[PDB]
Ligand binder design. Structure first.
Ligand SMILES: *[C@@H]1O[C@H](CO)[C@@H](O[C@@H]2O[C@H](CO)[C@@H](O)[C@H](O)[C@H]2NC(C)=O)[C@H](O)[C@H]1NC(C)=O
Ligand code: NAG
Ligand code: NAG
Ligand code: NAG
Ligand code: NAG
Ligand code: NAG
Lengths: 48, 48, 49, 262
């Protein structure tokens, strides 16, 4: 019973990760922030 | 401006360099020629 | 001259870089392109189009 | 010759919503898959666009006030609308913009013409030659000291001709886009981008603009050339550009496919 529960839990974890594009946001935020900052810096070259 | 070791010594402003990797200068390819391209004209302006 | 680090000035746009034959398709009124961060990255030649 | 003829019916003009129409390329910069925000003289979405009729009788060509920028649209197939005339006085005192686009040429002459109070173009048709030619050119009395000249190729209720006329920094910019229109009484809701046609460097003060239409008297008018005429059907729409910030969506090919009025 414990082995079956463990296997089912792992499968459900994979399904939740695959069918939800909002679980990894803690990483995505970081990436976005870095990219946004870089973009802002570059755009600051076009100011009088 | 003798060899990379001397440039590292100058960058660190010390005669003794510890083991490691140090950034000393920037490598940049200088331009070779000049290019001018403009629409075909054959008439001078009426400054006269 | 192409495939060389060269200065250039096309219809007033002056810069330094390497010019290469591109695959972009400009509309027949535009003169030069730009990047997402407003950086010149493509120019139409004023003679050969 | 100047002719002042009015036999049209009197009724107040109609109004409509501009919808997602009248967007032009602000600059000549190529962009691919980039959402670019600009602050230019644009036509607000669903604006109060004035509708003018030229049905057979209507020939309403009023002296509309050309504010900062003017949008203009026309669906027609008889080519009644030929050109537009701009100016602050419409008199031989000050320079007046004048454009005439018949089927054969496009004519731009920036002169201070002595404008007739009812400018128009007269086309007479005969069965034997089967040709529609313009007999009377009465939009002005005389050339009257032209200061600018330009002639180019002609621009070509089933076709839609959308123009935007904007005057800034001594430059008169025309943006046009020809599109096939299926509806015959109202602007379509589809999105269309107007490409620049020509930046004519005129640099005159313009406050009032007018449109030049044409008559097609062939054999249905028995009257003199002061009260009797006949023509086809035409409808045109006049909007006003305002300082607006627009979000323009460029596709990978460089053409604007969507826009947002902030
Ligand atoms: C361009 O022409 C317009 C229209 O005549 C001028 O604006 C007028 O200015 C006078 C100044 O006495 C006012 O009384 C009018 O009411 C204005 N008319 C409009 C429609 O606003 C304008 O000044 C001219 N431009 C220049 C630079 O002289
Ligand atoms: C001159 O320019 C024209 C128009 O772009 C072009 O067709 C022609 O080949 C050019 N002649 C040269 C570069 O000798
Ligand atoms: C458009 O103008 C007409 C003029 O009769 C007015 O009744 C209508 O409310 C206006 N619509 C607007 C401002 O949205
Ligand atoms: C069209 O073209 C010629 C050349 O500009 C011009 O002189 C002529 O008067 C025009 N034709 C008509 C019918 O107006
Ligand atoms: C045309 O010619 C002269 C020279 O510019 C000008 O002074 C005159 O007032 C003009 N006349 C008319 C009728 O446009
Ligand atoms: C760009 O044009 C090409 C022409 O081959 C077409 O296949 C493609 O779908 C166009 N792209 C877009 C985003 O409209």
């Amino acid at each position: 019973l414990i082995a079956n529960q463990f296997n089912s839990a792992i499968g459900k974890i994979q399904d939740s990760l695959s069918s939800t594009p909002s679980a990894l946001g803690k990483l995505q935020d970081v990436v976005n922030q870095n990219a946004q900052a870089l973009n802002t810096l570059v755009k600051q070259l076009s100011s009088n | 401006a003798l060899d990379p070791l001397s440039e590292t010594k100058c960058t660190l402003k010390s005669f003794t360099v510890e083991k490691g990797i140090y950034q000393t200068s920037n490598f940049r390819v200088q331009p070779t020629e000049s290019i001018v391209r403009f629409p075909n004209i054959t008439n001078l302006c009426p400054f006269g | 001259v192409k495939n060389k680090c060269v200065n250039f000035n096309f219809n007033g746009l002056t810069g330094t870089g390497v010019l290469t034959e591109s695959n972009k398709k400009f509309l027949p009124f535009q003169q030069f392109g730009r990047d997402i961060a407003d950086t010149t990255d493509a120019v139409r030649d004023p003679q050969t189009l | 010759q100047c002719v002042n003829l009015t036999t049209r019916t009197q009724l107040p003009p109609a109004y409509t919503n501009s919808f997602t129409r009248g967007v032009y390329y602000p600059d000549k910069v190529f962009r691919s898959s980039v959402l670019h925000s600009t602050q230019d003289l644009f036509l607000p979405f669903f604006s109060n666009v004035t509708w003018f009729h030229a049905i057979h009788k209507r020939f309403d060509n009023p002296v509309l006030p050309f504010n900062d920028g003017v949008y203009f649209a026309s669906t027609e197939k008889s080519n009644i609308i030929r050109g537009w005339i701009f100016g602050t006085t419409l008199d031989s005192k000050t320079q007046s913009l004048l454009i005439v686009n018949n089927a054969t040429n496009v004519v731009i002459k920036v002169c201070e013409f002595q404008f007739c109070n009812d400018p128009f173009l007269g086309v007479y048709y005969h069965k034997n030659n089967k040709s529609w030619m313009e007999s009377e050119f009465r939009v002005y009395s005389s050339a009257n000291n032209c200061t600018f000249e330009y002639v180019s190729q002609p621009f070509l209720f089933k076709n839609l001709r959308e123009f935007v006329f904007k005057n800034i920094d001594g430059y008169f910019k025309i943006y046009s886009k020809h599109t096939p229109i299926n509806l015959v009484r109202d602007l379509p809701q589809g999105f269309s981008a107007l490409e620049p046609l020509v930046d004519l460097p005129i640099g005159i003060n313009i406050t009032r603009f007018q449109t030049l239409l044409a008559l097609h008297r062939s054999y249905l008018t028995p009257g003199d050339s002061s009260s009797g005429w006949t023509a086809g059907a035409a409808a045109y729409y006049v909007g006003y550009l305002q300082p607006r910030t627009f979000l323009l969506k460029y596709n990978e090919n460089g053409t604007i496919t969507d826009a947002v009025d902030c």
